[PDB]
Structure 1
Amino acid sequence: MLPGTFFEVLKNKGVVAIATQGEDGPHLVNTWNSYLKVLDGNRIVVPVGGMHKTEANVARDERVLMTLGSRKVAGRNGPGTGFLIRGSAAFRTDGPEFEAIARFKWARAALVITVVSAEQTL
């Protein structure tokens, strides 16, 4: 399950980064800390406006990496912390996962990350 300090990071503002595998190299896109919706102990849902290249990548290789953090949350050995999340991704345009982020009217889809690991890297 996702750890307590991760939820503390979500309560603070910041830029989330999401890396996928493309045909010719990695691709890297963003969301905001505040936009992540956690379901159960292992699903993180992201509202999708663009992410067209990201979606194409995920369709061929479901594996994603995600990082996020905050200066305002104590880490393992000082002020500030962050996490590296590894998981499998899928895009949804309806159902409970889309409904989880449907408050964002600009969302054309939901990016659903099923987390396999969460490492506190700072």
Structure 2
Amino acid sequence: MLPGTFFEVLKNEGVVAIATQGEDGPHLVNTWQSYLKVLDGNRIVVPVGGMHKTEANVARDERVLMTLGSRKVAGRNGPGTGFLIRGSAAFRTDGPEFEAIARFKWARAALVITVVSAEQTL
């Protein structure tokens, strides 16, 4: 379901934001869009170093939001675009999904987001 424009965004560096439901409000953490590994079956894989609070939140409510964008990819009405992604999250520590981010020596886990929707919001 992830569109070509999203893959264009990934050719450019930028900050990714990942929102989870915490016990007293949202939580918000980051990765780099160059770190993202996209696998078939609508999966976005993020290398996890910290994200201990994020992981605890995901254990309670698997639903996450992710945003990312680039000034270098045209939106609907000018230069620059980005996406709101909604999906379900899981944390893997062995197997192919963990192996996907094993280029990152500092990683303790792989955050696997299975995308339910992707909305180009600009």
- TM-score normalised according to structure 2 size: 0.99
CA contact (8 A) 1:64 1:86 kept: yes
**Consecutive unaligned residues in structure 2, runs of 5 or more:** none
1:80-103 CA distances to partner (integer Å, 9 max, x unpaired)? 000000000000001000001110
How far apart, in 1, do the equivalents of 2:86 and 2:49 lie? 22
How far apart, in 1, do the equivalents of 2:57 and 2:12 lie? 29
How far apart, in 2, do the equivalents of 1:2 and 1:66 lie? 13
SS in 1 for 2:119: strand
Identity of aligned residues (%): 98
Aligned length: 122
CA contact (8 A) 1:37 1:44 kept: yes
CA contact (8 A) 1:15 1:31 kept: yes
How far apart, in 2, do the equivalents of 1:20 and 1:102 lie? 24
**Consecutive unaligned residues in structure 1, runs of 5 or more:** none
Alignment RMSD (CA, Å): 0.5
In structure 2, the CA distance between the partners of 1:23 and 1:15, relative to structure 1 (3 Å rule), is: same
In structure 2, the CA distance between the partners of 1:80 and 1:41, relative to structure 1 (3 Å rule), is: farther
How far apart, in 2, do the equivalents of 1:61 and 1:40 lie? 24
Deviation (angstroms), 1:41: 4.4
1:35-87 CA distances to partner (integer Å, 9 max, x unpaired)? 00000041000000000000000001000000000000001111000000000
How far apart, in 2, do the equivalents of 1:28 and 1:50 lie? 13
How far apart, in 1, do the equivalents of 2:30 and 2:64 lie? 13
Deviation (angstroms), 1:30: 0.1
CA contact (8 A) 1:14 1:69 kept: yes
